[PDB]
Design a protein around this ligand. Structure first.
Ligand code: IHP
Ligand code: ADP
Ligand code: MG
Ligand code: ZN
Length: 414
């Protein structure tokens, strides 16, 4: 708190990774105050804290709407909205630290070369912020040996919407996962090299064989949904981006990176490690409660979009400029409060569709790996629990429309 980060401090942070909204740097200096810690720094596209409608939508959380900055905002969103839903056991909202404009600029330039080219094209750190978040580095087993192998999972959405507000033209959405569909669109725009083999419904099934099936699939095609770290260094997956298919070569390096930690012989350490991850995922049941919060998206976007316009007090352009008689009347007949509720719960779900899980292993919650004769303690943590902006409802609808439209045309080539 009393700590204010300056330009010299910037030499003491290395590139860890990034998503779309934040840059994350690992500590690599000496100070006893930041050892075993990571820093989360908000980005701005190339191209005050809450909008008027946002202040309205979130009125039920007074602490949240009076947040002096977007760093406090996130902190309070986790603490006062996501925790009551997820539980505090595996959730850390982090600690604020005052930062200088110069620190931000120097760290911005420092890491540039370690960033993916397309990431740099789209956004850099927001240097107008006077704040950042310090978090426990989850690739270290606990604060204050030996080796720690850490696994990050981005599960995405693990259920299927029902047809009440999905017209027959988009019927596939009720039988094919958003994840599997987005794949084709992404491949088309060259945002990935191949289609994933990961099915989120498998991971969320609560069935052990299907959870192990998902892990194997996540190993084969990690993309941006699977990362492995050895004592804080990336040994599988992409750095701030999606990575391609696991080649025999990435297979060798990772298998060999596992000696010391997993005791097998020889090229079977991978198999047993996947088993390990799979056993920790199922046995902790940490996914079940995440699914419950994803299911707060009760109506799908094709439903919720209508409530969105009532909330912003705007003549619905979907019901207008579409066929009358196909105007979604039941939704618009709702009391304001129900409409506000539905869209609030839609945003929260979107947080849960887009967050990540980090699992920390060390040799001795535990897993008894039979095929190696080892025992591993684990720790589970939810990360990347960002507040989604209200105005994004419109782009969600447009992206969704684009997803199913592209997927239909591809399927129609029968
Ligand atoms: O930038 P990417 O790695 O491709 O991932 C993005 C990104 O997620 P993260 O930033 O959490 O990594 C978006 O989030 P923003 O940073 O833009 O907030 C998120 O968008 P929403 O969470 O708002 O949906 C989107 O998710 P989706 O594509 O399901 O909308 C998701 O894309 P992928 O997970 O598909 O890569
Ligand atoms: N507390 C943490 N410990 C270890 N790694 C982290 C932590 N927070 C983030 N990361 C890593 O940094 C990356 C980006 O973090 P994230 O919060 O997902 O950024 P964004 O908000 O842009 O999506 C993640 O993919 C994750 O691997
Ligand atoms: Mg995010
Ligand atoms: Zn409408």
């Amino acid at each position: 708190m009393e700590m204010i980060l300056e330009e010299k401090d910037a030499s003491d942070w290395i590139y860890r990774g990034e998503g779309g909204a934040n840059l994350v740097l690992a500590y690599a200096g000496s100070s006893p105050l930041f050892v075993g810690k990571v820093i989360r720094i908000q980005k701005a596209r190339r191209n005050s804290v809450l909008t008027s409608d946002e202040q309205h939508l979130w009125r039920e959380n007074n602490e949240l709407i009076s947040s002096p900055n977007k760093e406090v905002l996130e902190q309070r969103y986790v603490q006062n909205v996501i925790i009551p839903l997820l539980g505090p056991k595996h959730v850390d909202a982090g600690v604020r630290v005052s930062v200088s404009k110069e620190f931000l600029e120097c760290v911005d330039k420092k890491v540039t070369k370690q960033r993916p080219l397309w990431r740099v094209n789209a956004a850099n750190v927001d240097t107008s912020h006077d704040s950042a978040l310090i978090l426990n580095d989850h690739s270290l087993f606990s604060q204050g040996g030996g080796d720690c192998i850490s696994v990050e999972i981005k599960p995405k959405c693990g259920f299927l919407p029902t047809s009440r507000f999905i017209g027959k033209e988009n019927m596939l959405k009720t039988s094919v996962s958003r994840f599997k569909m987005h794949q084709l669109l992404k491949l088309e725009y060259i945002e990935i090299s191949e289609e994933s083999e990961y099915d989120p419904l498998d991971l969320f099934s609560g069935s052990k064989e299907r959870v192990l099936e998902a892990i194997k699939a996540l190993y084969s095609t990690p993309q941006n949904n699977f990362r492995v770290f050895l004592n804080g260094s990336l040994i599988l997956g992409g750095s701030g981006e999606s990575t391609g298919r696991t080649s025999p070569e990435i297979g060798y390096a990772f298998e060999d990176a596992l000696k010391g930690f997993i005791q097998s012989e020889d090229g079977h350490r991978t198999e047993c490690f996947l088993q390990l991850v799979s056993d920790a995922v199922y046995g902790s049941g940490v996914l079940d409660r995440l699914l419950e919060i994803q299911k707060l998206d009760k109506l799908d976007i094709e439903g919720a979009i209508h409530c969105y316009y009532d909330i912003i007090n705007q003549p619905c352009p979907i019901c207008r400029e579409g066929r009358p008689l196909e105007a979604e009347l039941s939704l618009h007949a709702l009391p304001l409060d129900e409409s506000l509720k539905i869209v609030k719960e839609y945003l929260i779900a979107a947080t849960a569709k887009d967050c990540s899980i980090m699992i920390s292993f060390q040799s001795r919650d535990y897993v008894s790996l039979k095929p190696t004769n080892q025992t591993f303690d684990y720790k589970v943590h939810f990360i990347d629990l960002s507040l989604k902006p209200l105005k994004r409802m419109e782009s969600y609808y447009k992206l969704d429309k684009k997803i199913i439209s592209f997927y239909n045309r591809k399927q129609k080539a029968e």
